[PDB]
Amino acid sequence: VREPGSQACLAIDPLVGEEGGAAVAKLEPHLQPRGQPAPQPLHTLVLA
């Protein structure tokens, strides 16, 4: 008989870098609000 002492099997486990991983970022455009005095289209009429 032989003993597995020296030849024992190996388990594996990755060295995950999640602890130092950057996050996913969401973008939102800062709308030029119409609540603030934004301009409007100058629909014109004629006084005949």
DSSP 24: P
- Cα within 13 Å of Cα(17), Cβ side: 3
Least gap, CB of 21 to another protein (angstroms): 26
- Does 3 bind another protein (CB under 8 A)? Our answer is yes
Site string for another protein, 4-43 (x = CB under 8 A): x--xxx----------------------------------
Distance CA 18, CA 24 (A): 13
Which residues of this protein are in contact with another protein, per CB under 8 A? 1-4, 7-9
